Structures are given as structure tokens and as C-alpha cells.
């Protein structure tokens, strides 16, 4: 977790669960990381038990998530002075987007009773729009790099563990040692025994 406290300040480092600094003490089963970019005014719309207009039609974080969001501001290849039409969002969706679900659609979404399935006009629009990721705009129009940490517990043996520090050698002086979870007290001397590699 030493590479998780740099790379620009995190706009929203406050968590809704286990502390980020306590993740080194506890080992976790699996981690889910999602990579997307949102606008500066869409940072506040994501919350446990709270949603906005853009957040309801997009990925939503429910009350029970076992994790939180860490987002920061960085503008190296995220903001374009001209056009930025690659990154898009959903603002006209069929229903509320349930968590842990995703959907892709490049086809037009109707707004009335006429089925727009190949033709459009005044009463039919397109469900996607592009962000105004421009440096000449305001703070709330600036792009933000957003990642959400999701954890699943009590479903698999734990293998994604935190970092464990190490100390220096000691000789001929009894200490309170700890070797891979084996605790004890005693001297540390050179051994004439022979083991097997397992």
C-alpha cells in the first residue's frame, strides 16, 4: 500500500468502512478495482444510500459495499483542449442501474410510445453524451481519475495480504521473536542441523 499514498492528492480519501491504513493489518480474499473518469461535479453524487442524476443511470455504490472510493485530480492525458468524445456517460437509461452490473448500447433510446428502432427525429434522442473535459472550463468540469476498492469476504481462502515488515539479525541474546506467525522467546544461535527444503 505504499504506492497508494502518492500519485496526486486524493480528492475524496474518506472511507465508508475499514480504514485504508488498517488494510495492512488484515488480509483480504479478493479486490475489485474499476477504472473510469468522471467530471468534477460528479464526484459528490456517488455515496452509500445516495445518488444523483448521472449516478442513478450509471454505476452505483450501495449501502453495503465492503469498500469505498478513492479519487484524485490529474491532467496528463485526461483533459483535452479540443474535443473529448471517447469518454461518455448515461443520462437516459431504461431503469435504475443495479450495483455490480454494466451495460453497453450504441443504439438510440426512445422517449415516447413510438418505437425508435432505426429512425429518429424530434421525439427521439440519444442516451449517451460526451464530457466537457476542457482545461478552459471550471473546477467542476475538470476530469477526475476515479477508482473504487471493492472487497468480498468469507468466500475464498485469503491470498491478497498486506505488507509485512522485516527486522535485522540478532545473535546470542534472547529476544521476543516472531517467525511467520510462530511466537516465542529465546536465543538465536547457529545450527548444525540439516532440514529438507519443505
Amino acid at each position, epitope marked *: 500500500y505504499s504506492v497508494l499514498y502518492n500519485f496526486a492528492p486524493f480528492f475524496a480519501f474518506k472511507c465508508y468502512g475499514v480504514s485504508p491504513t488498517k488494510l495492512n493489518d488484515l488480509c483480504f480474499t479478493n479486490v475489485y478495482a474499476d477504472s473510469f473518469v468522471i467530471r468534477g461535479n460528479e464526484v459528490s453524487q456517488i455515496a452509500p444510500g445516495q445518488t444523483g442524476n448521472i449516478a442513478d443511470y450509471n454505476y452505483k455504490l450501495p449501502d453495503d459495499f465492503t469498500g469505498c472510493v478513492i479519487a484524485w485530480n490529474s491532467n496528463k*492525458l485526461d483533459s*483535452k*483542449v*479540443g*474535443g*473529448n*468524445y*471517447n469518454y*461518455l456517460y448515461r443520462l437516459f437509461r431504461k431503469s435504475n442501474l443495479k450495483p455490480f452490473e454494466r451495460d453497453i448500447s*450504441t*443504439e*438510440i433510446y426512445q422517449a415516447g410510445n413510438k418505437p*425508435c428502432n*432505426g*429512425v*429518429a*427525429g424530434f421525439n427521439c434522442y*440519444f442516451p*449517451l453524451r*460526451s464530457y466537457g473535459f476542457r482545461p478552459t472550463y471550471g473546477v467542476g468540469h475538470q476530469p477526475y481519475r476515479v477508482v473504487v476498492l471493492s472487497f468480498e469476504l468469507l468466500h475464498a481462502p485469503a491470498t491478497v495480504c498486506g505488507p509485512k515488515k522485516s527486522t535485522n539479525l540478532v545473535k546470542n541474546k534472547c529476544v521476543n521473536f516472531n517467525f511467520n506467525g510462530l511466537t516465542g522467546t529465546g536465543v538465536l544461535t547457529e545450527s548444525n542441523k540439516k532440514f529438507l527444503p519443505f
Partner: antibody
Amino acid sequence: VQLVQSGAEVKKPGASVKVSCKASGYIFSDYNIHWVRQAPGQGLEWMGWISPDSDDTNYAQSFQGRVTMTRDTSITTVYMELSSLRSDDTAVYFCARSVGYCSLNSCQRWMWFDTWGQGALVTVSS
Amino acid sequence: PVLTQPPSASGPPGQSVSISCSGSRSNIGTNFVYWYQQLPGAAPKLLIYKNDQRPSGVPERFFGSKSGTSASLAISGLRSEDEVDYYCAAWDDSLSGHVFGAGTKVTVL
């Protein structure tokens, strides 16, 4: 901005030519450069775009290996190759500068062709 | 998916007329239709984008509109200085490229 062209000669079929459009005068990492050919006796054709910061392109179902598009960011100049010139290749490969990044397929719907400047003229003949 | 555009347009001056550029299924309607122009012996320019707003630098004579499969270009008044070669441009998801028709040539009657 300097959207001038590089001169090219007439070549018989069976060889390749070098066509270059100047991309200077503006920053290379945010504006896309498009190439549209105007051929008499038929409609215009558009084959594909580039991302002018890395290797990213998509080819339409009309040209597969005839046209190769490259990019250089050190001197901000782009070179294209036209091979096996024929009746279909008889067109003026215009240079179109537009806003947008366009590393995906859905970007092209919201994007319009901003400025056309100094299309290179290519004559196909033995 | 090839755009159908008439080769010659019979537009009489002094009265409005609308020309149609129709495509096919999943070619017009899923993506917008764009209107452009080019002078013979000169670089092309932009006429109408998105069929919603008229851009700056172009007089507000050509109307950007689309109704169903057929794309209708509406004009208000004809001038001898505005006989430029109009063109029909559209984006196709089934081709991943810009599709162009034959092109309209406008001659004063």
C-alpha cells in the same frame, strides 16, 4: 495553422509514393487528422482515423492493405503510403483537421470536420 | 448502406425546395447526418453539423433537418454566389467509416 502539403509525382502501378500533410501550427496530442478522398465518377470514401499519440486505428471495410497511416511527434509530421494506384485510387487525398481524441468507435458521431487545408493531388497513370 | 444522393438538383431561384438524401436501415437515425460543402478548386468547409444549430461564418440560409430515414435539406432563397457543391455525410456503425453519396450539382434554371 500550417496545413500545407508535400508535392508528389505521377507513378506507374506497382510502386508506392510518399504523401505528407503538414500538422504543425497546433498541438499534436488533441486534434485528430482525417483524410478524405474525392474521386470523380463515384462518391467520396473514408477509410480510417489515427490517434496522434500512440498506435491506435480502425479500418473500414473498403481498404485493408492499400493505405498505411503513420505518425511522428518529434517533428510533428505525418507520412502516408499509397500503393498499387489504379482507377479507384484516382482521387485528391484531402487533409482534414478536427477536434477530438477518438480512440473508440462512438466518438465519430459527435465529431465534425473542422478545417480542410491543402489537399495533396495524386494522379494515377502508367 | 451506400448513401443515395441525386446527381443533379433542379432548384429554381426565389422559391424554397427540399432535397432528400436517404440511406438504409441502421445507417440514418442511429447516427446523425452531416452537411458539408466544397468549392471546385478549393478546400472543403463546414455547412451544417448535428442538424440543430447553424455554425458561425456561414449565412443562415440552409436549414439542418432530419425526418425519418430520409434526410431533408431545406433552403430559403437562392443566390448565384451560393452555388457550392453540397455533400451528404453520415456515420455508419456497420461500416466504421464515413459514407458518402454521389453528390448534388445545383444549376440555376
